């Protein structure tokens, strides 16, 4: 096969992979997609960065506020009102807060598929989103910043930022499972090492991007 | 054989194993369900992740409860109202409280296949059907959260959350025992090392999750 200089996406990548493993037979190609579904997962299982982050409003309603399907991990959480940050704790503490009602430091916790907040908050969303209402961002309610499970590819012309930015990664990491389907293990080691060494670059990029501007270790607030 | 790209059912996985373990013969394919059963039992023996959790209402008669047959490991349990997270103690400690005890916290322990409670709690199951549009919870009930063993497939088109999330997890682990039937000793380590790599990949996705919101200290003081 052949490809274009940039590999925008699947429609070409699933071929370039066959290429980089020169012997592209059918028993092998038709599982290309599977190798890929493996690799992206092996990645996203632990990769965390902005581009997949999300803004979103919530509906607390009795503090049963439910967790979205797409959720993986939360970075921060707050209100659109006066910018109040929540913080997180365990049930074993929030329950005490309940048995000791008197609330400014808002806490919350993870009860199965549920989020609890100590004070009976009432942020809100509309009913199912037929919508017909921006509603000042749903009454400027809490807003969440969380990493979300990206969609598995399902189409050749389908795409993702990753390919705009860092496709060789996917290539190597799927070659990994491709060189496992058929026993060429030295190639495996090489693919894998390179995937990891490509990857850690990204997280370090992000780390060096985070906390820039020389902040003090912690502005000690008295109040 | 041939398999689809979105491997999601036990039926396709059974043929996918015969594809990656490329051999297809009566001496091998007929035992594949046993290999999958071996792989899942090994994985579920120690894996603890939220999607396999379960909510349940108890039937406390007099400070006692019978452990559900599907119970594996216990986590937080609380009252349906006002919270009051329960805590576990030893039989040698709860018995001390009974004889000397003639707002208080709640402690519980395990007597073989039974639960016990010091304050002699009485809880009841939901009132259940009739017209059966809702399932109305009853007052003075308790809610328990525990890890339950997922049912064995025992059926082709049956599916599980593991296949949806990490299909390669069971695929590599069942290749371990597949390479145990025929002594592909080199294959044993490669599937296992990849298998634990995927298996261990589960946990840091989870511990980075329960403490993701805002890592702080312990704001629980007695006052």
């Amino acid at each position: 096969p052949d490809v274009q200089y940039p590999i925008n996406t699947y429609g070409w990548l699933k071929k370039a992979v066959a290429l980089w493993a020169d012997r592209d037979d059918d028993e092998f190609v038709n599982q290309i997609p599977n190798f890929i579904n493996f690799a992206e997962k092996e990645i996203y299982r632990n990769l965390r960065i902005p581009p997949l982050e999300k803004e979103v409003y919530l509906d607390i309603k009795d503090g049963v506020a439910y967790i979205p399907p797409d959720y993986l991990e939360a970075q921060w959480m707050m209100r659109a009102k006066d910018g109040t940050i929540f913080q997180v704790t365990s049930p074993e503490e929030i329950s005490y807060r309940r048995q000791h009602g008197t609330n400014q430091p808002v806490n919350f916790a993870r009860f199965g598929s549920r989020f609890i907040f100590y004070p009976s908050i009432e942020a809100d969303t509309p009913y199912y989103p037929d919508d017909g209402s921006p509603l000042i961002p749903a009454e400027n309610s809490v807003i969440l910043s969380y990493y979300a499970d990206p969609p598995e590819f399902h189409e050749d012309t389908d795409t993702s930022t990753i390919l705009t930015i860092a496709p060789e990664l996917l290539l190597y990491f799927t070659l990994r499972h491709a060189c496992l389907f058929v026993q060429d293990d030295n190639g495996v080691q090489k693919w894998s090492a390179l995937g990891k060494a490509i990857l850690d670059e990204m997280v370090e990029q992000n780390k060096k991007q985070e906390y820039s501007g020389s902040p003090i270790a912690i502005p000690n607030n008295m109040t | 054989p041939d398999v689809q790209y979105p491997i999601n059912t036990y039926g396709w996985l059974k043929k996918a194993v015969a594809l990656w373990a490329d051999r297809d013969d009566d001496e091998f394919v007929n035992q594949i369900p046993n290999f999958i059963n071996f792989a899942e039992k090994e994985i579920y023996r120690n894996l603890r992740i939220p999607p396999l959790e379960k909510e349940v209402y108890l039937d406390i008669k007099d400070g006692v409860a019978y452990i559900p047959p599907d119970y594996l490991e216990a986590q937080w349990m609380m009252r349906a109202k006002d919270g009051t997270i329960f805590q576990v103690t030893s039989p040698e400690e709860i018995s001390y409280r009974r004889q000397h005890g003639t707002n208080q916290p709640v402690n519980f322990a395990r007597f073989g296949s039974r639960f016990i409670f010091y304050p002699s709690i009485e809880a009841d199951t939901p009132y259940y059907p009739d017209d059966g549009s809702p399932l109305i919870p009853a007052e003075n009930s308790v809610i328990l959260s525990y890890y339950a063993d997922p049912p064995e497939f025992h059926e082709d088109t049956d599916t599980s959350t593991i296949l949806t999330i990490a299909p390669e997890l069971l695929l590599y682990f069942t290749l371990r025992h597949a390479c145990l039937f025929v002594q592909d000793d080199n294959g044993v380590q490669k599937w296992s090392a990849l298998g634990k790599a995927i298996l261990d990949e589960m946990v840091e996705q989870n511990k980075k999750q329960e403490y993701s919101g805002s890592p702080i200290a312990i704001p629980n003081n007695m006052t």
Partner: peptide, 27 residues
């Protein structure tokens, strides 16, 4: 008053069943 997170498919079954009866008697 916080609800637990059981299987999503079961909640979807409760979601549609109650919605179907509510909207049908609504009609």
């Amino acid at each position: 008053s916080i609800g637990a997170y059981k299987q999503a498919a079961e909640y979807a079954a409760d979601s549609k069943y109650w919605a179907l009866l509510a909207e049908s008697k609504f009609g």
